[PDB]
């Protein structure tokens, strides 16, 4: 598969990009940040981590009514990147009506922005793992203070420890699906522990998907789950600028 603009069609973003004027007219926090570039437009510099901090926390309060708390010390996630995602996963577990759907995000990181965008958007339910302790209390307290501690269960996950392990203090019998971005030997060898807990795991999940950040890791893993010998294979590409992102889902299911 392939989306026009290199981003989904269901994506916000993709027809209505930021307007940082308007943001800066509402937000004096975001304001501070934005600068009046070479040409008499409000532009940011997306170089500094502190502009990009406002722009993340901003865009998640104005177009999605989330107030989160990230330090800079930890990945800022980029919102009409992260959202692509999000819309290919209801794409892919088939979200229309009223039914609940459960969900697990590995590394969820400081800002939980799957689960904050899922549960918020679709209200699915979710099993946000982190093995990092900063992003645990980071995600822990941005779930606390929206209100979604009935939707989002965040969880402090051992250093080593994967999808099977997470699955440890849950009585769930299937999950929709689980949606992951790796960290930064490397990312093939991760992506390639979450397939082996797939052959475990079988069809107690739906849809196993991963967020690729090198290119070069795509073809071996969908040789990976080939060898594997796994029915349902899909792949797509993201983009926002000059950031890319290949995304890999694979099921059990015939």
């Given amino acids: 598969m392939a989306l026009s603009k290199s981003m989904h069609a269901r994506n916000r973003y993709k027809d209505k990009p930021p307007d940082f004027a308007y943001l800066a007219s509402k937000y004096p926090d975001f304001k501070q940040h934005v600068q009046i570039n070479l ?22 309060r104005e177009d999605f009514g989330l107030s989160i ?15 692509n995602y999000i819309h290919w996963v209801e794409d892919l577990i088939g979200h229309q009506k009223s039914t609940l759907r459960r969900g697990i995000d590995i590394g969820t990181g400081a800002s939980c922005i799957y689960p904050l965008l899922g549960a918020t958007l679709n209200g699915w339910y979710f099993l946000a793992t982190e093995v990092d302790d900063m992003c645990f209390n980071y995600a822990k307290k941005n779930v606390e203070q929206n209100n979604l501690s009935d939707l989002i269960k ?9 999808l099977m392990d997470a699955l440890k203090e849950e009585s769930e019998i299937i999950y929709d699906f689980c949606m992951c971005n790796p960290p930064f030997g490397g990312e093939l060898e991760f992506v390639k522990r979450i397939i082996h807990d797939s052959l475990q795991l079988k069809k107690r999940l ?49």
């Avoid at 040409?39 to 998640?60: H, I, Y």
């Avoid at 965040?154 to 994967?162: D, E, G, I, R, Y």
């Avoid at 967020?211 to 792949?235: F, N």
């Fill in 39 to 60: 040409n008499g437009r409000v532009s940011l510099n997306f170089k500094d981590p502190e502009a990009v901090r406002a722009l993340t926390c901003t865009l998640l």
């Fill in 69 to 83: 708390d990230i330090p800079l010390e930890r990945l800022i996630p980029t919102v009409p990147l992260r959202l």
């Fill in 154 to 162: 965040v969880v402090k996950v051992p250093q080593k420890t994967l």
């Fill in 206 to 254: 739906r849809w196993y998907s991963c967020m690729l950040g090198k290119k070069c890791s795509l073809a071996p893993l969908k040789e990976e789950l080939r060898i594997q010998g796994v029915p349902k294979v899909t792949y797509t590409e993201f983009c926002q600028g000059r950031t890319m992102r290949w995304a890999l889902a694979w099921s059990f299911y015939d």
